[PDB]
From a paper:
After the recognition, eIF2 is released from the ribosomes as the guanosine disphosphate (GDP)-bound form and regenerated by its specific guanine nucleotide exchange factor, eIF2B, a heterodecameric complex of two copies each of the α-, β-, γ-, δ-, and ε-subunits. Various stressors such as viral infection lead to the suppression of cap-dependent translation and the activation of the integrated stress response (ISR), since the stress-induced phosphorylated eukaryotic translation initiation factor 2 [eIF2(αP)] tightly binds to eIF2B to prevent it from exchanging guanine nucleotide molecules on its substrate, unphosphorylated eIF2. Sandfly fever Sicilian virus (SFSV) evades this cap-dependent translation suppression through the interaction between its nonstructural protein NSs and host eIF2B. Here, our cryo-electron microscopy (cryo-EM) analysis reveals that SFSV NSs binds to the α-subunit of eIF2B in a competitive manner with eIF2(αP).
Here we determined the cryo-electron microscopy (cryo-EM) structure of the eIF2B•SFSV NSs complex, which revealed that SFSV NSs sterically blocks eIF2(αP) binding to eIF2B. We successfully purified the SFSV NSs protein and determined the complex structure of human eIF2B and SFSV NSs by cryo-EM at 2.3 Å resolution. Two SFSV NSs molecules bind one eIF2B molecule and are located between the α- and δ-subunits of eIF2B. We were able to assign the amino (N)-terminal ~200 residues out of the 261 residues of SFSV NSs in the cryo-EM map. The N-terminal region of SFSV NSs contains a β-sheet, followed by a helical core. The interaction of SFSV NSs with eIF2B is mediated by the N-terminal β-sheet region. The β-sheets and protruding loops form a concave interface that embraces helix α3 in the N-terminal domain of the eIF2Bα subunit. The very N terminus of SFSV NSs is also involved in the interaction with eIF2Bα. The interactions mediated by the eIF2B subunits other than the α-subunit are limited to those mediated by eIF2Bδ R321, which interacts with T35 and H36 of SFSV NSs.
Author numbering:
A (entry chain G): 166 to 521
B (entry chain I): 40 to 466
C (entry chain E): 1 to 10, 27 to 136, 154 to 238, 259 to 295
D (entry chain D): 8 to 99, 106 to 115, 121 to 351
E (entry chain A): -1 to 254, 268 to 305
The structure:
C-alpha cells in the first residue's frame, strides 16, 4: 500500500502531537510508476500539494474537486457491487494519501463531506454513466455556487462598507479580499490599501501585484510594523480560511495579532468568508489543531551567513513554523458572507440553516 | 594594503542633457536639492576612499567653485579631493591616458562617473579583486560592479541596458554587449570553447558604472589610442582573448543601491528612489552635506520639510514630497511625488504631480504641472497647464492661457530648445 | 494508467546480459507490467524470437520496416498508444530513480520531461535558475558560429545556465497531443534531433513546458563500441544490487 | 586639539553612517571617554564655559543620529556631574517644598579633578552593569518556566545564561524581522544548554497563551516609563497584556532618557525599503510605498517591571530615577 | 392614487395625536395598513412600489429609526404574503387580515415586555434610566403593581427635557425618583444597581440605536460592572450594521454647533434585551433577522 511519510526534525514538546514533514521528501519515491494503488490524478495533486504549487484554500478546494471529477470519469464499477459504496470506500485511501502529502484544509474537508453525501445519495437503480455525469455536474454546480456567486455577493455587500478616502488594511494573500478591492475600485470608490506581509511565505506580495495592476494605490510593510501604520488605517479587511462554530476565525498565523492591534488602535475589523468554509468544530487556541510546515523555511540569509544553518546540530534547539492561528470572536466586528453582514456569534446560525 | 584611491570624471562627454546643460554642468544638477557630484563624493568617502582625483573639462570653473565650498574640501575630510582640469579632454579614454602619463594611481584604484548615486561598500569586492590578483599573477585587470535588478524596473533605462555572459565559478566576464534596439542577442561559441561548464547568460544586472581597476587598465588605454569609453575597452579586451588575455571579472550586489544619472528618465527614477530612502543612509533629512540651507525634518508618508516653509491653509502634501528652506506654498494646493527647491513661491489651487522645481521657481495660482522639470528661477503665469515630460530651462517665463504639449522643451537658447520662448509659447 | 512503456530499436547483446534487458529490468522494478518493443527488421526481424526466451512479466513485440526513424517508428504504433508515452531505448544502462524524472512530469504538468547526465558536434543546453526548466536546445550543425537567444526569453528568465558537455539518456515522458502532432506533421523524422528542439523553441511564442533532470552518477553507453567496454567495467559494479 | 577634533569627527561620521559600536555599553564607554578628553584637552575657565562647550558637542552628536539616545544620556549625565561638583565646591529639583521655602561664573582649581574622578567612577560602575543585572536572574525565574524574547538583547542573554546555571526552563525567541537577529540569540542560548524555540513574530500572539513571563531588552526608556524598543515589541506587549502575562524589561540605567513621547516622526528609525521589499520586484516598486521602521513605541502601562543595575522598579517610579540622574534644565540640551 | 401624500401625512399625524400612548412605529404601520386597504390596484408590483413610496414619505415626516424598521417589516410582510398566494385578489384579503392580527400583536407587545421584564427589579433596588420611554414607564408600573419598592434616577436629556417628563410620570404613581444632569451619569452610576433604557432601533449585531446619551451611559455601566438592560419591541429590529458612531445613517442623527439625536450601543455593552419574543441575548437578534429574510 502507501507508506507512511517520515517526520522531519525535532518538534516542540507542545506541538509533538502534530506531524511535521520535509518539503524535499516526497511520498512518490516509494510508489509504483505507473501509479496503481493511487489514481494518477490524486498522485499529481498530492505532489503539487506537498511542494506548495497550489496554496490558496479556494485554489486547493478547486484542484481537489477537479481531481475528484477526473477520478469519477475514470471510475468503473466492479461486478456484484454498488457505486454508492464502492466509490466511497475507494476514495478514502486517496484522501489519506493527500493528507499524508499535506494536512487537509477546512474547505477541502467540507468539499469531501459534500461529495460523500452526494455519492451516498446516488440510487442503486441509477445507471453507471448517468450517475457519473450527475456527480460531475453536481461538482461543477458546487464549485459555481460556493465560489463564484458567493464571491460576487460578498463583493456587492462589501461595496457598501467602503467609502471614498478611507484606508483599508489587508493581510497576506486572499482571492476574496483582492476581488472585493478590485470591484470596489472599479465601481468608482477612491481609496488606498495597506498590505501586511509575514515571513516565510510572503504571500501578501501576490496581492500587492494585483493592486498595482488594478490601479489601486498600495503600501507594503511587514507584520511587526503593523502597530506603526494602524493610526492612519480606517478599516481592516481580513480573509479567513475557516469559521468555527463558536465564532472564532481560523486563518493564517498573524491574523489574530492584527485583530488585537487594531482593537488596541480602535480600528474596526472586518472578515470576509464564504459560508462553505464554516465548520461545526470548535477550537480555543492554536495548539490543539494546527499544521507544522518545513522548519528549514525559517532559515534566512542575513549578511553573509545563515544563522539557522545546520540547526539540528544543537540538541536543545527547535524550529517552529506555525501555519494557522485562531482569532477569538471578541476581536472581530463583522463577518461578510453571501448571506449578508452578520456578527461572529451568528456563525452557528448559518450552520443551522445550511444543513436544513 | 596601500591607501585606496579613486578617479572621478566630472565631465559627461555625451550630450544627453541639452539644452539644460548649456548653462549648468550635469555634475552640478540638483537631484534632491543636492548636486550629483556631492552624492558621488559621499559614496566614495563612505566606502573608504582616501584620495579622489576629479577631472573636469566642460564648465570646470563652476565645478571647482562648488567643490572648494563643499564639505570634502575641508582639512578635516578623510578623503582628499584633487582637481585636475584640462580643456583637451574629449572622452574617458583621454582622462585615463592622462592618469597613466602622470602616474597618479599606484595600485587598485576605483573608477566611477560624477553622476553616480550609490551606497555600495566595495570592501568585499576589493578583497576578492586583490586575492584573485595575488593568486593569478595580476592577470585580471578589471572588476565591474552590477546590481541584481529586474528588466522592468524604471532604473533599467533602454539606452544603458546590458546583457552579459560570465563564468559562474570564478565570476569571469566572457561576453558583454548592449541591448539598444535589439530583439535578438547573439553569443559566439568561442567562450564555450573555454570550458564545458560555468557559462551563464545574465540579463538581470544593472550597470552601476563602478569599476575596480588597475594601473594596467590605464596602460592598456594608453596602448590603444582608439579607446574612448569603457565599453570600447571591455569589448576590445574580450574579443582579443588569444593574446595577453587580461581577464575581466565582475561583482554583483543585492542589498545595496547603485545607479547613474544619464538622462531625464534616469534622473526622475533616481530622485524617486532617493526620496523613498532607497539609498539609505543617503536621505534628505540625513544632511550628508554639512550645509545649513539643506536641513529638513522627515515625517510620515515620506514628507521632508525644511526650515521656514509656512505651508498654506487647505493645502495637502500626499506623499514623497521634499520642501526646501524658504519655500512658500499657497492655499488649497496639492503636491505629490515632487521635489521643490529652496526659495520657491507657489500660488493657490496649484497641483504639482511628479514635478521637480529648482531654486527660485515662482508658480502662479491655478497652474497644473505633471511630470515636468523647472530649472533655476523659472516662472509660470496664471492658467498654465504643463503636460507630462515638459522642461523649462534657466529663467523661462511661460505666458498665460496656453497648454503646452507633452514633449515641450523651452530654454532661452533658440536652436537647441524645441520651442524657444521668453514670455510665452506663442512666438 | 498515466504511462505506457515504449521501447525503440531500429539490439545485439553486447555484455553479460542482453542490452535490451537492462531497460526492461528498470521498467520492471519501477512498476511497469505492460511493455511495447519495436524490433529492428533491416537485417532480420528475429529480435522477437530472441526475446521470446526471456523471463520478463509481459512484452509485446512488433517488427519494424526496412528503414525508419525514431519519430516514424513512434508513428508506427499509434493505435497501441492511448495515454502519455514513456519512450526509451535499449542502450539505457543506468541506476536512476525514475521518480526523479516522472515527478517533473507530474508536479508541473509538463509537456515533456527528459533525463540527461554529466559528461565524462556538442549540444548546448540552456536551463533556468532552478536547473529544471529547459529553455534552450541547440547543436552546432544549425548555428553559424553565433548562438542566438530571443529577447523575450531573457525578459521572462534573466538567468540561463548553459551546459556544453551533457549526455542525453533518450528517456522521454511525452503527452498524447505530442504524438498527435507527430502524426499530423510527417516532416519530423527523429524525436531526439528535431521534435525536442521544436518543442523547446515553441515553449516561448495553450502553454508548453519542457523539463530535464540532470544526473551525476551513471549514464548509458553510447551506440559506438568504444564505450561498450566501459559499461561492462561498470556492469559488475551495478550487477550486485540489480 | 587636532586629535580631539579628529576623534569627534570620526565619532559623528560613524553615528551618521551607522555601525561602529555594536554594544550599547561600548557606545556609552566611548561617549564618556570622548567627553573626558574634551574636558581635559579643551581650555575653559569656569563651569559655564565647560557646560556650554559640552552642550554644543552633545547637540552635534545628537543631531548626528537622534535615535542613539545613549550619547545624549551620557552628555546629560556629565552635565549633571559637573553641576553637582560645582554646587559642592561653591554652594551648599522643582518641588512644592522648594517652591514654598524659597551662577556658574566662579572658577575653582580643583573642580576639573573632581569632574574627572566622578567620570571615572561612572565608567567603573558602567563596567559592572551587566553582571549586576544578571545577578538577579534567580529571583525572577523558577523551575520549568517558559520565557518569551524578541530580537537579540545581550542583557537578556546574560540574564538567561546566568539563570540556566541552576534552573531548567524553556525560552521562545521571535525573529525580529527583517533583521532576524533572534536566530543568533536562539543559537547562543541553545549552545548554553537551554531548550529554545525559533518562531516568527506572526506567531507571537498564538503562543502567548502558553508563556509564563516575557523578558525583553530596550533601546531607550522615556521619562514616563515608556519604551523605545525594536519593532514588533508593541505587539508583544499588547499580547502579554491580553493574557496578563508579566513583562520584564532588563535595561541598564544608562538607557534612561529624560525626553517625553511628545516628539514625533523622529522616534522610529526608517531604513532602506530593500529590507522589506527587494529591489528585484521590478515595475511595481514604482507605485508602492514601502516603509521599514526599526523601532517601536511601547506605552508604560504595558510594562510590569524594570530590572537595572540598582534593582527592580515599577514604571510609575521611573520619573524619580530620572530626577536623580538629570537636571531639568538639561532636557532641551 | 386613492390616498394622497397630504392626506397620508394627515392620517399619520392624526393617529399619533389621537392616541399619544401609541409609538411612532405602530402609527406608521397602521397608516401603511390603511393605505393598503384603499389602493384600488390590481398588480402586486404597483402595490409594492406604492408602499415603498409611502414609506419614504412617512420617513420624511419623522426621522425615527422605528418608522423605517416598521416600513421594512411591512415590506417583508407583503413579500411573504405574495409568496404564499399568487393571485392578487386572493392575496389582498389575506394581507388585510394578517395586518389586523399583526396590529393586535404589536399592541400587546408592550404589556408582554412589561410582564416579562418587571421580575428583574428587586426590593430596594436603584434603577437608572436615561430619558423618557413608554416601555420603561410600563415596566416600572408593573413592578410597582407587584408591591415592590425601589428608587429611580433619570437624566434630564438636555436636547429636549424628556427626563423631566419621565420623572413627572413616575411621580404620578408615587415612585421615589431623582433628576440628574447628563454629565452626572458616571457620578451616579455607583449608586444604581441596574440600568434599564429604551431603544428606538435594534441593529443586526444586537446593539441598539437610542437617544444621544445612551452610549456613554452604557460605557459607564460597563466600567463599574453594572447590568445594562434594554427593553425594545420586535418591530424595531433593523438590518443595519454600524461599525462606529459615524457609520450611523445621517437621516436618523439629525432633524428629529452639531447636535446628533441618536447614538449606537454595541452588543458587548448590553446584558439582556426584553422584547415581546422574550428575554434574549444580543446574538438572538441576528438569528431572528436571518430567519425572517429566508
Amino acid at each position: 500500500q502507501v507508506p507512511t511519510r517520515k517526520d522531519y526534525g525535532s518538534k516542540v514538546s507542545l506541538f509533538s502531537h502534530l506531524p511535521q514533514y520535509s518539503r524535499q521528501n516526497s511520498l512518490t519515491q516509494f510508489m509504483s510508476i505507473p501509479s496503481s494503488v493511487i489514481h494518477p490524478a490524486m498522485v499529481r495533486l498530492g505532489l503539487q500539494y506537498s511542494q506548495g504549487l497550489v496554496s490558496g484554500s479556494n485554489a486547493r478546494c478547486i484542484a481537489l474537486l477537479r481531481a475528484l471529477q477526473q477520478v469519477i470519469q475514470d471510475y468503473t464499477t466492479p461486478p456484484n457491487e454498488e457505486l454508492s459504496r464502492d466509490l466511497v470506500n475507494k476514495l478514502k485511501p486517496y484522501m489519506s494519501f493527500l493528507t499524508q502529502c499535506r494536512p487537509l484544509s477546512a474547505s477541502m474537508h467540507n468539499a469531501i463531506k459534500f461529495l460523500n453525501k452526494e455519492i451516498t445519495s446516488v440510487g442503486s437503480s441509477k445507471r453507471e454513466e448517468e450517475a457519473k455525469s450527475e456527480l460531475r455536474a453536481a461538482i461543477d454546480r458546487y464549485v459555481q455556487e460556493k465560489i463564484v456567486l458567493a464571491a460576487q455577493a460578498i463583493s456587492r455587500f462589501a461595496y457598501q462598507k467602503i467609502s471614498n478616502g478611507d484606508v483599508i488594511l489587508v493581510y497576506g494573500c486572499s482571492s476574496l479580499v483582492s476581488r472585493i478591492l478590485q470591484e470596489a475600485w472599479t465601481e468608482g470608490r477612491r481609496f488606498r490599501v495597506v498590505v501586511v506581509d509575514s515571513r516565510p511565505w510572503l504571500e501578501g506580495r501576490h496581492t500587492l501585484r494585483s493592486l498595482v495592476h488594478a490601479g489601486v494605490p498600495a503600501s507594503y510593510l511587514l507584520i511587526p510594523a503593523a502597530s506603526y501604520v494602524l493610526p492612519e488605517v480606517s478599516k481592516v479587511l481580513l480573509g479567513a480560511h475557516a469559521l468555527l462554530a463558536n465564532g472564532s476565525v481560523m486563518s493564517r498565523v498573524g491574523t489574530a495579532q492584527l485583530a488585537l492591534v487594531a482593537r488596541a488602535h480602535n480600528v474596526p475589523v472586518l472578515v470576509c468568508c464564504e459560508t462553505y468554509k464554516f465548520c461545526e468544530r470548535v477550537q480555543t487556541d492554536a495548539f490543539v489543531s494546527n499544521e507544522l510546515d518545513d522548519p528549514d523555511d525559517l532559515q534566512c540569509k542575513r549578511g553573509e551567513h545563515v544563522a539557522l544553518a545546520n540547526w539540528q546540530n544543537h540538541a536543545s534547539l527547535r524550529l517552529l513554523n506555525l501555519v494557522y492561528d485562531v482569532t477569538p470572536p471578541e476581536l472581530v466586528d463583522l463577518v461578510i458572507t453571501e448571506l449578508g453582514m452578520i456578527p461572529c456569534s451568528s456563525v452557528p446560525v448559518v450552520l443551522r440553516v445550511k444543513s436544513s | 594594503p596601500p591607501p585606496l584611491q579613486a578617479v572621478l570624471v566630472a565631465d559627461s562627454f555625451d550630450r544627453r542633457f541639452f539644452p539644460i546643460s548649456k548653462d549648468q554642468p550635469r555634475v552640478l544638477l540638483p537631484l534632491a536639492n543636492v548636486a550629483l557630484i556631492d552624492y558621488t563624493l559621499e559614496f566614495l568617502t563612505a566606502t573608504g576612499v582616501q584620495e579622489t582625483f576629479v577631472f573636469c573639462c566642460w564648465k570646470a570653473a563652476q565645478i571647482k567653485e562648488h567643490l572648494l565650498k563643499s564639505k570634502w574640501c575641508r582639512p578635516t575630510s578623510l578623503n582628499v579631493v584633487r582637481i585636475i582640469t584640462s580643456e583637451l579632454y574629449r572622452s574617458l579614454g583621454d582622462v585615463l591616458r592622462d592618469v597613466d602619463a602622470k602616474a597618479l594611481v599606484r595600485s587598485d584604484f576605483l573608477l566611477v562617473y560624477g553622476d553616480v548615486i550609490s551606497n555600495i561598500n566595495i570592501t568585499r569586492a576589493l578583497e576578492e579583486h586583490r586575492l584573485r590578483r595575488k593568486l593569478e599573477k595580476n592577470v585580471s585587470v578589471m572588476t565591474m560592479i552590477f546590481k541584481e535588478s529586474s528588466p522592468s524596473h524604471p532604473t533599467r533605462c533602454h539606452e544603458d541596458n546590458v546583457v552579459v555572459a560570465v563564468d559562474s565559478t570564478t565570476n569571469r566576464v566572457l561576453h558583454f554587449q548592449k541591448t539598444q534596439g535589439l530583439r535578438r542577442f547573439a553569443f559566439p561559441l568561442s567562450l564555450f570553447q573555454g570550458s564545458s561548464d560555468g557559462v551563464e547568460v545574465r540579463y538581470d544586472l544593472l550597470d552601476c558604472h563602478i569599476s575596480i581597476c588597475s594601473p594596467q587598465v590605464a596602460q592598456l588605454f594608453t596602448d590603444n589610442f582608439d579607446y574612448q569609453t569603457r565599453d570600447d575597452f571591455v569589448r576590445g579586451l574580450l574579443v582579443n582573448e588569444e593574446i595577453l588575455g587580461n581577464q575581466i571579472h565582475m561583482h554583483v550586489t543585492a542589498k545595496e543601491y547603485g545607479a547613474r544619472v544619464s538622462n531625464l528618465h534616469m534622473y526622475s527614477a533616481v530622485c524617486a528612489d532617493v526620496i523613498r530612502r532607497w539609498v539609505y543612509p543617503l536621505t534628505p533629512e540625513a544632511n550628508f552635506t554639512d550645509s545649513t540651507t539643506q536641513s529638513c525634518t522627515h515625517s510620515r508618508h515620506n514628507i521632508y520639510r525644511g526650515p521656514e516653509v509656512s505651508l498654506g491653509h487647505g493645502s495637502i502634501l500626499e506623499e514623497n514630497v521634499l520642501l526646501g528652506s524658504g519655500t512658500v506654498i499657497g492655499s488649497n494646493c496639492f503636491i505629490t511625488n515632487s521635489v521643490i527647491g529652496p526659495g520657491c513661491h507657489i500660488g493657490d489651487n496649484v497641483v504639482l504631480d511628479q514635478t521637480y522645481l529648482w531654486q527660485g521657481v515662482r508658480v502662479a495660482a491655478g497652474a497644473q504641472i505633471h511630470q515636468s522639470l523647472l530649472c533655476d528661477n523659472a516662472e509660470v503665469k496664471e492658467r498654465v497647464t504643463l503636460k507630462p515630460r515638459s522642461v523649462l530651462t534657466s529663467q523661462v517665463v511661460v505666458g498665460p492661457n496656453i497648454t503646452l504639449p507633452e514633449g515641450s522643451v523651452i530654454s532661452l537658447h533658440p536652436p537647441d530648445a524645441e520651442e524657444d520662448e521668453d514670455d510665452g509659447e506663442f512666438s | 494508467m498515466e504511462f505506457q512503456a515504449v521501447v525503440m530499436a531500429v539490439l545485439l547483446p553486447v555484455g553479460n546480459k542482453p542490452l535490451i534487458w537492462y531497460p526492461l529490468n528498470l521498467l520492471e522494478r519501477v512498476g511497469f507490467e505492460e511493455v511495447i518493443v519495436v524490433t529492428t527488421r533491416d537485417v532480420q526481424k528475429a529480435l522477437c524470437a530472441e526475446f521470446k526466451m526471456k523471463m520478463k512479466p509481459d512484452i509485446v513485440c512488433i517488427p519494424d520496416d526496412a528503414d525508419m526513424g525514431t519519430a516514424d517508428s513512434l508513428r508506427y504504433i499509434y493505435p497501441k498508444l492511448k495515454t502519455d508515452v514513456l519512450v526509451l531505448s535499449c542502450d539505457l544502462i543506468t541506476d536512476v530513480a525514475l521518480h526523479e524524472v516522472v515527478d517533473l512530469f507530474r508536479a508541473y504538468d509538463a509537456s515533456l520531461a527528459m533525463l540527461m547526465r554529466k559528461g565524462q558536434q556538442r549540444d548546448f543546453i540552456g536551463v533556468d535558475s532552478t536547473g529544471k526548466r529547459l529553455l534552450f536546445m541547440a547543436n552546432e550543425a544549425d548555428l553559424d558560429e553565433e548562438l542566438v537567444i530571443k529577447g523575450s526569453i531573457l525578459q521572462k528568465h534573466p538567468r540561463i545556465r548553459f551546459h556544453t558537455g551533457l549526455v542525453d539518456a533518450h528517456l522521454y515522458c511525452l503527452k498524447k497531443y505530442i504524438v498527435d502532432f507527430l502524426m499530423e506533421n510527417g516532416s519530423i523524422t527523429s524525436i531526439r534531433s528535431e521534435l525536442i528542439p521544436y518543442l523547446v523553441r515553441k515553449q516561448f511564442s495553450k502553454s508548453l513546458d519542457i523539463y530535464s533532470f540532470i544526473k551525476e552518477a551513471n549514464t548509458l553507453n553510447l551506440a559506438p563500441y568504444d564505450a561498450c567496454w566501459n559499461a561492462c567495467r561498470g556492469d559488475r559494479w551495478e550487477d550486485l544490487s540489480r | 586639539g587636532s586629535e580631539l577634533s579628529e576623534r569627534i569627527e570620526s565619532f559623528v561620521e560613524t553615528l551618521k553612517r551607522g555601525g561602529g559600536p555594536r554594544s550599547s555599553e561600548e557606545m556609552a564607554r566611548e561617549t564618556l571617554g570622548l567627553l573626558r578628553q574634551i574636558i581635559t584637552d579643551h581650555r575653559w575657565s569656569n563651569a559655564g564655559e565647560l557646560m556650554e562647550l559640552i552642550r554644543r558637542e552633545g547637540r552635534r552628536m545628537t543631531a548626528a543620529q537622534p535615535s542613539e539616545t545613549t550619547v545624549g544620556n551620557m552628555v546629560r549625565r556629565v552635565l549633571k556631574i559637573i553641576r553637582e561638583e560645582y554646587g559642592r565646591l561653591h554652594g551648599r529639583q522643582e518641588s512644592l517644598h522648594k517652591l514654598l521655602t524659597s551662577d556658574f561664573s566662579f572658577h575653582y582649581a580643583q573642580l576639573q579633578s573632581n569632574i574627572i574622578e566622578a567620570i571615572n567612577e561612572l565608567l567603573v560602575e558602567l563596567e559592572g552593569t551587566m553582571e549586576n543585572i544578571a545577578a538577579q536572574a534567580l529571583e525572577h525565574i523558577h523551575s520549568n518556566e517558559v520565557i518569551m524574547t524578541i530580537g537579540f538583547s545581550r542583557t537578556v542573554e546574560a540574564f538567561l545564561k546566568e539563570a540556566a546555571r541552576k534552573r531548567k526552563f524553556h525560552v521562545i525567541v521571535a525573529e525580529c524581522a527583517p533583521f532576524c537577529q533572534g536566530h543568533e540569540m536562539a543559537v547562543n542560548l541553545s549552545k548554553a544548554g537551554i531548550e529554545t524555540t525559533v518562531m516568527t513574530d506572526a506567531a507571537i500572539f498564538a503562543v502567548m497563551s502558553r508563556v509564563n513571563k516575557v523578558i525583553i531588552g530596550t533601546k531607550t526608556i522615556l521619562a514616563n516609563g515608556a519604551l523605545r524598543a525594536v519593532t514588533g515589541t508593541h505587539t508583544l506587549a499588547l499580547a502579554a497584556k491580553h493574557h496578563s502575562t508579566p513583562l520584564i524589561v532588563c535595561a541598564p540605567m544608562f538607557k534612561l532618557s529624560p525626553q517625553f513621547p511628545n516628539e514625533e516622526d523622529s522616534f522610529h528609525k526608517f531604513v532602506a525599503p530593500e529590507e522589506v521589499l527587494p529591489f528585484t520586484e521590478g515595475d511595481i516598486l514604482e507605485k508602492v510605498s514601502v516603509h521599514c521602521p526599526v523601532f517601536d513605541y511601547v506605552p508604560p502601562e504595558l510594562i510590569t517591571l524594570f530590572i537595572s543595575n540598582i534593582g527592580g522598579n515599577a514604571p510609575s517610579y521611573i520619573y524619580r530615577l530620572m530626577s536623580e540622574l538629570y537636571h531639568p534644565d538639561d532636557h532641551v540640551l | 392614487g386613492p390616498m394622497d401624500d397630504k392626506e397620508l401625512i394627515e392620517y399619520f399625524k392624526s393617529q399619533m395625536k389621537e392616541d399619544p400612548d401609541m409609538a411612532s412605529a405602530v402609527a406608521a404601520i397602521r397608516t401603511l395598513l390603511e393605505f393598503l386597504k384603499r389602493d384600488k390596484g390590481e398588480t402586486i408590483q404597483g402595490l409594492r412600489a406604492n408602499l415603498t413610496s409611502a414609506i419614504e414619505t412617512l420617513c420624511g415626516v419623522d426621522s425615527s429609526v422605528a418608522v423605517s424598521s416598521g416600513g421594512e417589516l411591512f415590506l417583508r410582510f407583503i413579500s411573504l404574503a405574495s409568496l404564499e398566494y399568487s393571485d392578487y385578489s386572493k392575496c389582498k384579503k389575506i394581507m388585510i387580515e394578517r395586518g389586523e392580527l399583526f396590529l393586535r400583536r404589536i399592541s400587546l407587545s408592550r404589556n408582554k415586555i412589561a410582564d416579562l421584564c418587571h421580575t428583574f427589579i428587586k426590593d430596594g433596588a436603584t434603577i437608572l434610566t436615561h430619558a423618557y420611554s413608554r416601555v420603561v414607564l410600563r415596566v416600572l408600573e408593573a413592578a410597582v403593581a407587584a408591591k415592590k419598592r425601589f428608587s429611580v434616577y433619570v437624566t434630564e436629556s438636555q436636547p429636549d427635557l424628556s427626563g423631566k417628563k419621565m420623572a413627572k410620570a413616575l411621580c404620578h404613581l408615587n415612585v421615589p425618583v431623582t433628576v440628574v444632569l447628563d454629565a452626572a451619569v458616571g457620578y451616579i452610576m455607583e449608586k444604581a444597581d441596574l440600568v434599564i433604557v429604551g431603544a428606538e432601533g435594534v441593529v443586526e449585531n444586537g446593539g441598539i440605536i437610542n437617544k444621544i446619551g445612551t452610549n456613554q451611559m452604557a460605557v459607564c455601566a460597563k466600567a463599574q460592572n453594572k447590568p445594562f438592560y434594554v427593553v425594545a419591541e420586535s418591530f424595531k429590529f433593523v438590518r443595519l450594521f454600524p461599525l462606529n458612531q459615524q457609520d450611523v445613517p445621517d437621516k436618523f442623527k439629525y432633524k428629529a454647533e452639531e447636535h446628533p439625536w441618536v447614538d449606537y450601543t454595541a452588543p458587548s455593552l448590553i446584558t439582556l434585551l426584553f422584547t415581546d419574543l422574550g428575554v434574549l441575548t444580543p446574538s438572538a437578534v441576528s438569528d431572528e433577522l436571518i430567519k425572517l429574510y429566508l
